[PDB]
């Protein structure tokens, strides 16, 4: 998920611009739901996942808000001490304590029901048990007990009229989520919201802790500690699942890292290109970042250094020449299915070979597989979510930076060989692989483009529509499932705000019994593909001016 918030010192012809691209994957019917709420203290417009009561993407005519996943480490695993003498108990604070348990029966269409037990301790639900060591692992969430409070915080924040009112609600949102703010005066802000544990001294948050009592969390850290900024000197707030703040630790997931190689730098390059950005320029950052190969910037310098003494006819040099002439933006040929340039394929093959020769070889199996992905993994239906720099590629980037990297290279990933030798060997592999598929004339290589699919199964893998309702878009775009933009105090209008979004395939998923699809079933699909957008209305007069239908209900509670 990405977001860029442009404040007063960086905005052209406006005081603030907020552009959000939350990446949840692509689904039919749409992941988010367009909705306006007016009355009972609310006056809001936007769209939100699964029609939650609180709009995650929207504005109220005074402030606007958005989110990206936080990826803080708000989850630890406690290793509970069991005893074969006392099944169902665990040792905590010197006493054998009874686990809480519940029975659940799964009813099955055209099959036999299955009953099982869920177990829970003071540290959370049990995930797995090792009878050999008499240990059960419980998953402890810093937000446990605050789920409903989080939903309500996301609802009540829609009534805030300033940073103080908004952050009072941000402090009540317990999940690990980056929240963003902008307002009519040009103020902008960011809070990496959530509950985070206050851990005992010596607790390494990447690895399990004993559950016998001494390693229990002290409590939760205070809201003062959550990373936040209001009106940064840079004039902007950008995020693409990157770190919130210097020295702040990431999620403990082994395939997730915050390091020198980060895709957010592609947004910084665009925001810093020119002194100010108009709304149109801020929107265009979606198009460019969506087409940007994320590995070219990282590895081109290493490729150029490795090939700098080679002769003009050396194919390893000619592959790098091809990359040097390219900006990394992928565009479809006129056939609508191949890319104009072959660079992503060159980078994919090269990085695959590099990782095999370096990070993969240093790690024991079956863990090594964990580091072999190049980041260009997909399906013929295309990527299921955003594209990113792979974990192995991030680790390789620290190795190729040599002593510019702050990470101690405990193991030399090049195993004593000059890095140039390994880089060149991977280029030889690249030439062999690709010339065998496409021939020896790189200028005619028509490499396959990734596509995008609005899947009929939701993100859990569960049908939410019939299979035939899947929709297809020729161009994969590494962008939000929806995109929304809010412009405050434009100089081009007297209105304090202007806002737009896109909810594809459309607002409605309704299909009548006879198969007739709703009038709003697919009317945002082409707009999505073409980087278009529709107006979000807020005022009574704008809604009335753009009215298609209305109903009046008369109901007593």
């Amino acid at each position: 998920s990405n977001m860029w918030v442009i404040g007063k010192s960086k905005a052209q012809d406006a005081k603030a611009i907020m552009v959000n691209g939350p990446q949840f994957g692509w689904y039919a019917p749409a992941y988010t739901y367009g909705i306006g709420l007016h009355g009972a203290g609310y006056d809001v417009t936007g769209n939100t996942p699964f029609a939650y009561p609180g709009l995650v993407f929207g504005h109220n005519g005074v402030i606007s808000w958005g989110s990206t996943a936080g990826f803080g480490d708000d989850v630890d695993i406690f290793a509970e001490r069991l005893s074969a003498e006392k099944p169902g108990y665990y040792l905590h604070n010197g006493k054998w304590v009874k686990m809480l348990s519940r029975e659940e029966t799964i009813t099955v269409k055209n099959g036999q029901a299955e009953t099982f037990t869920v177990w829970r301790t003071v540290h959370g639900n049990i995930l797995q048990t090792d009878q050999t060591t008499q240990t059960a692992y419980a998953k402890s969430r810093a937000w446990d007990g605050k789920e409903v409070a989080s939903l309500l915080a996301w609802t009540h924040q829609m009534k805030a009229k300033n940073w103080q009112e908004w952050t009072q609600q941000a402090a009540k949102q317990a999940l690990t989520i980056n929240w963003y703010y902008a307002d009519v005066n040009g103020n902008i802000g960011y809070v990496h919201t959530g509950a985070y544990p206050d851990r005992q001294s010596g607790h390494d948050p990447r690895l399990p802790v004993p559950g016998t009592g001494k390693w229990d969390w002290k409590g939760l850290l205070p809201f003062e500690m959550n990373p936040k900024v209001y009106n940064p000197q840079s004039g902007y707030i950008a995020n693409w699942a990157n770190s919130p703040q210097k020295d702040y630790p990431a999620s403990d997931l082994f395939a997730f890292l915050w390091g020198g190689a980060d895709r957010v730098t592609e947004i910084d390059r665009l925001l810093e290109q020119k002194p100010r950005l108009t709304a149109d320029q801020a929107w265009d950052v979606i198009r460019q970042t969506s087409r940007q190969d994320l590995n070219l910037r990282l590895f081109l310098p290493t490729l150029q250094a490795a090939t700098s003494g080679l002769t003009q006819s050396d194919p390893r040099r000619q592959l790098v020449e091809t990359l040097t002439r390219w900006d990394g933006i992928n565009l479809l040929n006129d056939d609508g299915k191949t890319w104009q340039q072959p660079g992503s394929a060159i980078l994919n093959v090269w990085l695959t070979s590099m990782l095999k020769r370096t990070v993969v070889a240093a790690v024991p199996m079956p863990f090594d597989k964990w580091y072999s992905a190049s980041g260009y993994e997909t399906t013929q239906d295309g990527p299921t979510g955003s594209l990113n720099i792979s974990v192995g590629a991030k680790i390789l980037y620290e190795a190729v930076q040599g002593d510019k990297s702050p990470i101690p290279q405990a193991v030399d990933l090049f195993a004593g060989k000059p890095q140039q030798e390994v880089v060149l060997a991977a280029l030889e592999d690249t030439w062999e692989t690709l010339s065998k598929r496409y021939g020896n004339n790189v200028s005619n290589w028509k490499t396959p483009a990734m596509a995008l699919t609005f899947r009929a199964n939701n993100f859990f893998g569960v049908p939410q529509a019939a299979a035939e309702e899947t929709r297809h878009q020729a161009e994969y775009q590494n962008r939000g499932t929806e995109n929304d933009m809010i412009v405050f105090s434009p100089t081009t209008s007297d209105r304090p705000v202007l806002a737009w979004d896109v909810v594809a395939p459309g607002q409605s998923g309704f299909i009548a019994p006879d198969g007739t699809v709703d009038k709003h079933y697919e009317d945002q699909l082409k707009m999505y593909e073409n980087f278009g957008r529709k107006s979000l209305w807020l005022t009574k007069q704008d809604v009335e001016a753009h009215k298609e239908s209305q109903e009046v209900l008369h109901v007593q509670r």
């Binding site: 999940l175 010596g202 082994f254």
Partner: protein, 207 residues
């Protein structure tokens, strides 16, 4: 009056709800959601509660077990029971609005039942506040705020120590899965602030 709810749809079908109290506002929201996305919402309810196999069969049993094992529903109900009347009105109004449309659907299914119910062989039932709450809890919380790999991390660390020795294996873990990396691009610039806590990086909880 407090009983009136106005619904206006724009030229893209987006609904705008007008009401005079909390329950009525969220009732209008639930109503239009049930009009536009009933099948999607039904299937999201089953996904968030682990009752997919009931309608889709044996391929979804492990899924349903995994969902139920990852939460404690009675605790969510306890949170709902603690809400003030105003807060409860958000969830109750939403559920009550969906139910008003669902009841219309089940009274005239020949024209109002989404085709997918016929395709998949079942009909929609009413909603309660817990269900509305669980659409959020089961997506944002139990899936998008619930990420850990610590048991796998420990297995990787153990394998690194078996390959490289205790000290070098811990240092290789710190090379592959660093706690923090000071060259990471940060949303907040260093001039503004930095996080003030330092963490153990050598598994000292079991030293």
């Amino acid at each position: 009056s407090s009983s009136e709810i106005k619904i206006v749809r724009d030229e893209y079908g987006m609904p705008h709800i007008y009401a005079n109290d909390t329950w009525h506002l969220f009732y209008g929201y639930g109503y239009v959601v049930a009009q536009d996305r009933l099948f999607q919402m039904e299937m999201a309810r089953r996904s968030t509660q682990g009752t997919v196999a009931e309608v889709l069969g044996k391929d979804f049993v492990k899924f349903d077990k995994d969902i139920r094992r990852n939460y404690w529903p009675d605790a969510i109900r306890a949170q709902i029971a603690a809400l003030s009347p105003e807060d409860m009105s958000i969830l109750q109004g939403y559920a009550d609005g969906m139910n008003a449309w669902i009841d219309k659907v089940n009274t005239n299914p020949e024209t109002l039942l989404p085709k997918q119910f016929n395709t998949f062989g079942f009909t929609p039932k009413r909603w309660e506040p817990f269900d509305v709450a669980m659409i959020f809890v089961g997506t944002m919380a139990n899936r998008f705020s619930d990420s850990t790999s610590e048991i796998d991390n420990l297995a990787l660390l153990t394998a690194l120590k078996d390959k490289y020795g205790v000290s070098q294996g811990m240092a290789v873990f710190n090379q592959l899965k660093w706690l923090v990396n000071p060259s990471a691009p940060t949303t907040i610039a260093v001039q503004e602030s930095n996080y003030p806590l330092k963490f153990n990086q050598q598994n000292s909880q079991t030293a």
